[PDB]
Amino acid sequence: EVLITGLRTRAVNVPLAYPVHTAVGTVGTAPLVLIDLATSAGVVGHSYLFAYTPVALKSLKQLLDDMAAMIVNEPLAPVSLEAMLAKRFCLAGYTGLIRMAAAGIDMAAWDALGKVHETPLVKLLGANARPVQAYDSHSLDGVKLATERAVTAAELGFRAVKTRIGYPALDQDLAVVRSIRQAVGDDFGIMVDYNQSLDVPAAIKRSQALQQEGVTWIEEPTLQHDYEGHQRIQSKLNVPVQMGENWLGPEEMFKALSIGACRLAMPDAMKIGGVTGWIRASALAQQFGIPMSSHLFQEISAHLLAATPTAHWLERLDLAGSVIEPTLTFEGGNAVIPDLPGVGIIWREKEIGKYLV
Amino acid sequence: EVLITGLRTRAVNVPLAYPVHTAVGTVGTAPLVLIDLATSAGVVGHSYLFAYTPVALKSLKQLLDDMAAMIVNEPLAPVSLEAMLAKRFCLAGYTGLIRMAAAGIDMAAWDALGKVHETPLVKLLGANARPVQAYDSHSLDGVKLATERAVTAAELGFRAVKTRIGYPALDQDLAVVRSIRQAVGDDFGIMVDYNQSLDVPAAIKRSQALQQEGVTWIEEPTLQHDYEGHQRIQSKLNVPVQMGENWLGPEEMFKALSIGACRLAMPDAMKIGGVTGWIRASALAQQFGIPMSSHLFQEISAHLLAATPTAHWLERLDLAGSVIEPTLTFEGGNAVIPDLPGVGIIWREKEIGKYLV
Amino acid sequence: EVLITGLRTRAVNVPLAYPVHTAVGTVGTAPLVLIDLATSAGVVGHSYLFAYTPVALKSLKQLLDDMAAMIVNEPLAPVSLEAMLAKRFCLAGYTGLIRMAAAGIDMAAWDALGKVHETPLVKLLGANARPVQAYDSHSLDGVKLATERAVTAAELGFRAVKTRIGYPALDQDLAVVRSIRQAVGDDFGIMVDYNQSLDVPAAIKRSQALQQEGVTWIEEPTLQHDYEGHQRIQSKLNVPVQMGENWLGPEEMFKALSIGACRLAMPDAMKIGGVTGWIRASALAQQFGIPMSSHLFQEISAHLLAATPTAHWLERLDLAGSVIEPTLTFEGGNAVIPDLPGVGIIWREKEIGKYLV
Amino acid sequence: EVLITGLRTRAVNVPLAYPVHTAVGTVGTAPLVLIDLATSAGVVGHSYLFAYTPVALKSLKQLLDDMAAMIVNEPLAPVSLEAMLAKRFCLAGYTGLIRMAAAGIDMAAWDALGKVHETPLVKLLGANARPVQAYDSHSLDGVKLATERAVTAAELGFRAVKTRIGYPALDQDLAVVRSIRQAVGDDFGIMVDYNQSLDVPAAIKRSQALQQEGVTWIEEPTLQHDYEGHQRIQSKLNVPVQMGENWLGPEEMFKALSIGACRLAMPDAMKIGGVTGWIRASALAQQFGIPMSSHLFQEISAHLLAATPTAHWLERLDLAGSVIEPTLTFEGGNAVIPDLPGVGIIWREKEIGKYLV
Ligand SMILES: O=C(O)[C@@H](O)c1ccccc1
Ligand SMILES: O=C(O)[C@@H](O)c1ccccc1
Ligand SMILES: O=C(O)[C@@H](O)c1ccccc1
Ligand SMILES: O=C(O)[C@@H](O)c1ccccc1
Numbered sequence A, B, C, D: 001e002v003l004i005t006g007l008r009t010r011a012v013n014v015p016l017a018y019p020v021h022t023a024v025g026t027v028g029t030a031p032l033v034l035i036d037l038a039t040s041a042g043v044v045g046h047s048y049l050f051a052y053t054p055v056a057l058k059s060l061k062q063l064l065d066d067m068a069a070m071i072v073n074e075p076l077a078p079v080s081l082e083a084m085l086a087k088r089f090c091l092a093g094y095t096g097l098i099r100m101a102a103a104g105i106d107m108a109a110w111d112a113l114g115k116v117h118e119t120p121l122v123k124l125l126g127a128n129a130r131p132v133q134a135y136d137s138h139s140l141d142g143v144k145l146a147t148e149r150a151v152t153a154a155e156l157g158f159r160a161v162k163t164r165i166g167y168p169a170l171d172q173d174l175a176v177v178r179s180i181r182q183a184v185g186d187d188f189g190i191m192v193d194y195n196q197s198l199d200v201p202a203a204i205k206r207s208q209a210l211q212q213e214g215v216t217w218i219e220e221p222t223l224q225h226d227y228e229g230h231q232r233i234q235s236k237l238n239v240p241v242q243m244g245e246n247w248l249g250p251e252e253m254f255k256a257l258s259i260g261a262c263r264l265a266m267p268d269a270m271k272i273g274g275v276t277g278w279i280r281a282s283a284l285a286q287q288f289g290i291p292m293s294s295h296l297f298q299e300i301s302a303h304l305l306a307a308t309p310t311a312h313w314l315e316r317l318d319l320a321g322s323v324i325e326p327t328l329t330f331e332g333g334n335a336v337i338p339d340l341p342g343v344g345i346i347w348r349e350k351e352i353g354k355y356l357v
């Protein structure tokens, strides 16, 4: 009955509202691939993929264009499509870029499904829309800018910020945390992200000093793939260890949870396998007793978390704002699902034209 | 937008096409509760619950009638409804009869959801309909009747039968298995169910003799709740141990899988928590590497298994055939989802009137 | 020789001396089922069941009335009766409402046994009566009422109170604990109950702050069924974790103890399987090294704990006081078994008439 | 001193000497990317990457072309280069296509290193060249062709063949194994590959029947990423379980070995991280006590295995034969390293021109 009839992809480099500071330098643009999934019913599903670095952007788009042939003419049934792709790529390696690509199709396919039934994605998954608490995600900004950005966030109504740390000296990490605290008061959440930059012993030492400061969570303290090493750092902390943005598929999350690597999880809608992967990851999180937050893709995450038993926080990081209408709104620090079928992503065609690669 | 506006329940005692023989005696009827879930959209969701024994039938219906007040006027959103009930019953004990009842509402609620969107349940879950291999489930029938019933099943096209064993002597269990084999040939599957009737040492002994015969699986050899004891029996077998019909909620299945109690799982749609519980159990089965079959509720299971990554077998045991139209058909030993919105359950009002309790 | 000859049940809604405050609102009545077990010897055993919510009350009574047929004419031998019921319900699910019902019959059957031999239950179990320290159990009462109620308890001679916590902010939980402490002095015990309301990370954080305050125990911090999650919270505390009120049968307690979920146990006489289940649970507690307290059913618990090797505290929460004579007395904060055959439960027929449902 | 000065890549689709039969159909060509790594010393390193499917070929080449900018002007020091890339891709995901690409550069970089020092790679790694036993790798060929191909292999001097199995029926897998055996005699090795096509229970059953036949190893019986599931199948076999062709980096091999997933390993030079990854994987294999064989890349594997303490077999599967000179020779079933600097890969420029994509 409803068939997929085409796939069109466009690679852009969009400006970021909040340039992200890093050890290297400032990055003011995001490399995205926009996807349009056409169907025999006259509706188009939409989604986007984040490439992380301009180095992979063209390659990601080419991969997607080359896979269009496997999905054109298949029924618009995301669970069954996902099983087919996992089988086609079983030798090449259903992970990395290939898995991300497939996740792109899944999210667009679900968006079209919601449109066929004229219903918001959240409702198609069987849950009600509810606002989700969100925190504003900042970067490796230095004491002054980090403080400045936190003050603005509280001004906009957020009740928590995420800062990135990992300066050369521990003393610099703490300066930043303290300056934020002083300007925002003691209620306020302050999440901190190490972005995989420390070895285990250094992680235990810096984390215990931070725990004494009062942070909400300690995220990705060491190499993302070393589960066992995250479990060792967690074993010496009261504050929770957060991770999950880099799990490629729920079978990687299962491995890390099976070992006790962390006390909080934050899957990335794209890497986790789209809507289909997320539903799976949510069942796991529920059973292991782990609060689950999101990483990027704020548009679809708002819907995904509402249907997530252990939902915890939504990460506000607006990558695609320049090319999409602002249908997701934040009120009182909570993300509010818009009442539009699918995920509610609507392109600003005019602008996309400017950033085309 | 779509609200639940009423709940009506009717308790019946229906005749069984295949009287089930047991150690005690023959049972020719099934105690069911039919549920009708009305909604503000003009559609009615339907489902049924199996009470196992007439002893619990009135109590089950009374429980459901008494909970109608908590769900009337709530939005028709099964995932969110399920979370609310788990919270209302957190002190009483969200398990047993209460959990079964809630599972009744979930299945009816999902059936209504499929009707609101005029789509079969399988498609609403995001998968395509596909036929599912099914095996015909018989009872503790003795050599002659068990053989007879197997021959008929193969005549009707099935390619596997389940017999119940656990006679006073092992030698009787084997007589039955061998007589079936001789009449159906070596290709044919022969599943055997102990229904929790042996202690661990007796299970290891009888199972190893059966493994030598050639059975497809060994199901519930000891008390259902002794996970660790199932893991011990499994540790000495090549043939797989099957179980799962008695898990109340995916959190019980999680416990048994975490320990390696079995190599096959067969959740019961009602005890597992309905459609919402099943989706959860399917994610777990996928990650632990376990083929997953169904227990009873053949109507909705056909749809559920099509959306189940590790689907394995559908259990044909027609409890409600006397009061429902035969929309599910078996062709070539495979169950075929009917193309009707929801689950495809349509009452035979006329007959229900006869079996009313 | 002594046979069971009848079962009569009456469902009531009794007033509580101490209205229990909850997040939802105040509850001033308890839904109970009273049971009378008649015997061929001319004696009647008595017991009661607590239904938790009015939603389950009629269903519980109907279940009991429907099972009377299986026990009428059986010998008055509680251990053998319990084995028979566990076998009749092996498919339906010997847990939840069914298990509670069976536990009702067990307690009444033991009460009749004590009456046949004209001896208090404690003595029939082979132990001497001894007073048991008891603590007064209060609710989610707020700083003012919680303090008030604690002061009264100390006035009545108790040397410990249980308060329920789990306010929206940790700071509210602590305010309450501190206000109580200030009014009762530092000797005094202060137990706190979370009633399953926190996720694991939140439990570790709030518990460590409370441990610093000085509480006696931290009870049910997270979902009752997540044993592994209780073990994680316990692993980061010095103060003990308490739980057990929700174990359905000693086979659930065995599972939680096998994993180290807690350092204290407090089985509920009804859910644990009656007198027969308790004796079993007491043997387990002894071997795992766990002090064992009671949950509700103060009348029979006084007798049960005297025969319990690791007995610890008796929970004073008078559910049935309105319809039973006050034969159990508290003197000097210790419950005192009355010297009457059986459990010493004697109905106030007059009043029961008022609360009948 | 020696700098990398350029990277040129060419995507080809080469004919295979031995068309590979699969469940789907016959594939007569291999999608490869050839890499030329230029250096300031006047030497060019060469290597190739296998893309598995034409779907990923253009994307792989584009990725490599886009990363050339990060390596141009860096010193020709493969260990240090590899650390730099692992750090650049730490957010995107250093695995999948990105990891394969980086592995392409590593192998070419090592080939150039051997050329700068005018020495064969094996000698630069500190070991002597020695012949390595090799087995001829065939496909899902059916009884007749599989037998035919085995007979030819023995004619050419090989003393072992690998066949792929996984037919719809176990009986078909065995027919093939037996027919081969009959034509090659009992000495001969017969390896069998399931290519991830069975679930765990089906793997245990089919493997035990094969073990009875007499195979050398059972390779990839279930999903490659389910380590724990491979460990379960291995636990019921005497014959060893082989796997490793799909490990992306030694950190995935470490995970599988840490759990006992298999008794033999066979890393793939490209997926394992090139020469730098292999040296690492060889140290692990040595310590866990596992014989280590190769998967594809026969040219460089011959050198790699000579420096590998637990070396076991070399897999003969000639993907690039159409575009490279035949410097690697097989004599007496043993691969013989050629005496040429680097890996000994020399392009047939003329032909490459024909297969260019
Ligand atoms: O958690 C986060 O937001 C960061 O780790 C992050 C990683 C990659 C891109 C942007 C942001
Ligand atoms: O697996 C099965 O079918 C049996 O265990 C079974 C149990 C309860 C009712 C009917 C059938
Ligand atoms: O431990 C306790 O007393 C509470 O958890 C409690 C639970 C249920 C009913 C009353 C009281
Ligand atoms: O081990 C082997 O050779 C096979 O698994 C194989 C896999 C992928 C490509 C070619 C061959």
Ligand SMILES: O=C(O)[C@H](O)c1ccccc1
Residues within 6 Å of the ligand: A020, A021, A022, A027, A029, A030, A031, A052, D091
């Ligand atoms: O530093 C990072 O977070 C990363 O490189 C990044 C983040 C957001 C946009 C572009 C690039």
Ligand SMILES: O=C(O)[C@H](O)c1ccccc1
Residues within 6 Å of the ligand: B020, B021, B022, B027, B029, B030, B031, B052, C091
């Ligand atoms: O023996 C059984 O399977 C069980 O008691 C039963 C099965 C089917 C219908 C009624 C009762």
Ligand SMILES: O=C(O)[C@H](O)c1ccccc1
Residues within 6 Å of the ligand: B091, C020, C021, C022, C027, C029, C030, C031, C052
């Ligand atoms: O909140 C509770 O403790 C529970 O709902 C309750 C307790 C005591 C009587 C009635 C109900």
Ligand SMILES: O=C(O)[C@H](O)c1ccccc1
Residues within 6 Å of the ligand: A091, D020, D021, D022, D027, D029, D030, D031, D052
């Ligand atoms: O079936 C396979 O082995 C795989 O798809 C393949 C192998 C060799 C060349 C091309 C493709």
Ligand SMILES: [Mg+2]
Residues within 6 Å of the ligand: A193, A195, A219, A220, A245
């Ligand atoms: Mg992060």
Ligand SMILES: [Mg+2]
Residues within 6 Å of the ligand: B193, B195, B219, B220, B245
């Ligand atoms: Mg069964």
Ligand SMILES: [Mg+2]
Residues within 6 Å of the ligand: C193, C195, C219, C220, C245
């Ligand atoms: Mg309590």
Ligand SMILES: [Mg+2]
Residues within 6 Å of the ligand: D193, D195, D219, D220, D245
């Ligand atoms: Mg292979």
